[PDB]
Amino acid sequence: AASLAPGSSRVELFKRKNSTVPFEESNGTIRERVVHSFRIPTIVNVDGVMVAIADARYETSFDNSFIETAVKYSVDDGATWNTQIAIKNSRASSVSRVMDATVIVKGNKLYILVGSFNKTRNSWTQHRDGSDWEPLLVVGEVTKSAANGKTTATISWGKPVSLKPLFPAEFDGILTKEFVGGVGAAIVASNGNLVYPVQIADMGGRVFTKIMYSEDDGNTWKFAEGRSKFGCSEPAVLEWEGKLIINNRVDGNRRLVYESSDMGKTWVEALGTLSHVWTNSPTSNQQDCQSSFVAVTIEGKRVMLFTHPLNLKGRWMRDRLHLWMTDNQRIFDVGQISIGDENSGYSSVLYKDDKLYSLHEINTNDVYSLVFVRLIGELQLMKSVVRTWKEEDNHLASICTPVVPAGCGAAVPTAGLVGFLSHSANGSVWEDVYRCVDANVANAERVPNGLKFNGVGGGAVWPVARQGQTRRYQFANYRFTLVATVTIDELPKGTSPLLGAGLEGPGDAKLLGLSYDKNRQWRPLYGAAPASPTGSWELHKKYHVVLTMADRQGSVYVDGQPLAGSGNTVVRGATLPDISHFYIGGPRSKGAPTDSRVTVTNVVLYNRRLNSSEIRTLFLSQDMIGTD
Ligand SMILES: CC(=O)N[C@H]1[C@H]([C@H](O)[C@H](O)CO)OC(C(=O)O)=C[C@@H]1O
């Protein structure tokens, strides 16, 4: 949906210049105080109690102003709420502030880490030293009661404890200045560790991220050895299949995502899955924004949810908040959860008792409220998509493939299967069976499990960089396998394209691909190498084509055997390639008026290089995988 979906709705929960908080005076008296702006939302579930956490920016929405940490909590899924100030600021000056709450729930405890500042008027990364700052950890305890039918809850907040004595003065060379949590909901790892992703500023103002974790429920804390590149901030972390996945804010460039299998000791950029997929605006050169990144189980399948504005207006406007759902292979855009063209901002998502919610910013004139959203239409779509993913994976994995010399052979590969183009299509769209990235079609006619091309630019474009802002097939620049069943229907005049990966840039360079020629020979394309002919094919005969690329090496297989010239380097330099799209047939909107008379069916895309057993299995099961 292009806006909050039919069936969903929201309320303004923390209302700018309206909702009050129980401000505690120095003398201990409480006064209901109006709050200019509420920012930096997090919503979590603590033993059945929704707890919403926010910066209460009392006087202005500016970062360096008088701020305290507010909490609203509900025992009836948002029907009613109680309000508190969980963490007070130091009251040292007119701009004293506790801000940027990062939260972990473990049992009936909430662990909140905030940055506390006394008097600075400038931005944290630019301070002369860390003398105005303390990282404060606060523990809240949620207690539920039951009085003749009615359930109520209380939350007690402990005294803040400064973690400044535990912050090293240096990291491998780097002289430290300050750190804050990554903002939003953090995690308890499967081993019980409290895991905060942190953002650290060095003396010069460079920012980078790290994991800070505790093995003893916050009694002690350790900074793990790994770190992000410089320029990463506001990290969000979740645990996936035994690894921490750290998703970073990157002002002015695409978002970096890292994985660590050893509690943050070693970080590896997620080039094969999520790194550089998301970004800060269509042109990637704008201020970025915080994102929520949470693992949940929907319809029996573990998935990750990610929120971020499209920010088409740029700077801090942060219009058009979207929610994506991924299983680390496919990436589905659930849609826009903010309304129309409104400015949004920081966000949080919660899945609780089979209902989905969001708490996020709305901004008019830099006065901010937080809306509490019931994502009813969105959850319905998510469940449908997860059912599609499970049904197709289970179907493929259950195919009885032919036995090979060494009941059934090996399973049709489903691990890392990202996209599949098969029977469903129309005149302009070839549908991804996995519902994420369709291919665009021209001059085509439907055939079982695919399309027959006839006319100028007859073919399909499966966009890679051409997806635009959110690059869900960015993994292909690091590795991929592309598979298809093909027939050549008419001889070409000279050479004509069939299947491949095109590159952005001058001319019409290809990374890896296959063409065919008037002599009935194949013409594999291995990067920039002169594409000489090899082998032999016949008109009207079906052939299986597999292109593999990993470790900068490319191979082209026909009928399960590599063509001459395979197995060499196809990308030179150290710079990742920038694939524009996969082409199927001879699509084009300009240049030579290519017209490849071929029929292509069952196009499969994987985010890894399939092994020999897998390639053979696909070659032997071509008549078995189609959607019909
Ligand atoms: C401590 C602090 O300043 N946090 C602020 C953060 C920060 O200024 C930026 O990441 C540059 O370091 O920015 C934003 C923001 O809406 O973009 C809100 C945070 O409250």
With helix as H, strand as E and coil as C, how does 38-84 read? EEEEEEEEECCEEEEEEEEECCCCCCCCCEEEEEEEECCCCCCCEEE
Give the whole-angstrom CA distance, residue 88 versus residue 22: 11
The CA-CA-CA angle for residues 102, 103, 104, to 5°, reads: 140
The CA-CA-CA angle for residues 422, 427, 433, to 5°, reads: 25
* Ligand 1 atom 12, closest CA: 125
Residue 379 neighbours by CB under 8 Å, 6+ apart: 298, 355, 356
Give the whole-angstrom CA distance, residue 377 versus residue 454: 41
Give the whole-angstrom CA distance, residue 155 versus residue 144: 9
Resolution of this structure in Å: 1.6
Give the whole-angstrom CA distance, residue 282 versus residue 468: 7
Reply yes or no on domain 411-612 having CATH 2.60.120.200.
yes
Distance from the alpha carbon of residue 289 to the mean position of ligand 1, in angstroms: 9
Fold of the 1-386 domain? Neuraminidase (2.120.10)
The backbone torsions φ and ψ at residue 429, rounded to the nearest 5 degrees and listed phi first, read: -130, 135
* Ligand 1 atom 8, closest CA: 123
Tokens 């290519």 -> residue: 594
Distance from the alpha carbon of residue 454 to the mean position of ligand 1, in angstroms: 54
DSSP annotation of 467 reads: G
DSSP annotation of 288 reads: -
Phi-psi region of 218 (alpha: psi -120 to 50; beta: other; left: phi over 0): left
- Report which secondary-structure segment, H or E, holds 162: strand 161-162
3-state secondary structure (DSSP) of residue 477: helix
Give the whole-angstrom CA distance, residue 116 versus residue 137: 10
Identify whether the C-beta of residue 145 lies closer than 8 Å to the C-beta of residue 153. Answer: yes
Structure tokens at 114: 């905030």
Smallest Cα–Cα separation from 183: which of 138, 249, 240?
A: 249
DSSP annotation of 412 reads: P
Residue 345 burial (10 A CB sphere; 0-12, 13-18, 19+): buried
* Ligand 1 atom 5, closest CA: 63
Residue 353 burial (10 A CB sphere; 0-12, 13-18, 19+): exposed
Residue 204 neighbours by CB under 8 Å, 6+ apart: none
Smallest Cα–Cα separation from 554: which of 583, 532, 524, 531?
A: 524
DSSP annotation of 228 reads: P
Distance from the alpha carbon of residue 62 to the mean position of ligand 1, in angstroms: 10
Identify whether the C-beta of residue 415 lies closer than 8 Å to the C-beta of residue 561. Answer: no
Strand partners, 458: none
Distance from the alpha carbon of residue 238 to the mean position of ligand 1, in angstroms: 21
* Ligand 1 atom 17, closest CA: 289
Report the half-sphere exposure of 337 (CA within 13 A, side-chain side): 34
3-state secondary structure (DSSP) of residue 612: helix
Identify whether the C-beta of residue 187 lies closer than 8 Å to the C-beta of residue 174. Answer: no
Structure tokens at 172: 């491998």
The CA-CA-CA angle for residues 163, 168, 174, to 5°, reads: 135
Distance from the alpha carbon of residue 123 to the mean position of ligand 1, in angstroms: 8
Smallest Cα–Cα separation from 539: which of 519, 513, 559?
A: 519
Domain boundaries, the chain: 1-386, 411-612
Pocket lined around ligand 1, Cβ cut-off 6 Å: 40, 63, 99-100, 115, 123-125, 180, 233-234, 316
Residue 219 burial (10 A CB sphere; 0-12, 13-18, 19+): exposed
Question: Could you identify the atom of ligand 1 that is nearest to the CA of residue 287?
Answer: 17
Distance from the alpha carbon of residue 63 to the mean position of ligand 1, in angstroms: 7
Q: What is the distance between the terminal CA atoms of the chain, rounded to a whole angstrom?
A: 28
Tokens 């990157």 -> residue: 250
Rg (CA), the chain: 27
The shares of helix, strand and coil residues in the chain, as percent rounded to the nearest 5, are 5, 50, 45
Q: Which residue type does 18 have?
A: N
Give the whole-angstrom CA distance, residue 559 versus residue 375: 47
3-state secondary structure (DSSP) of residue 339: coil
Same fold, 1-386 and 411-612: no
3-state secondary structure (DSSP) of residue 210: strand
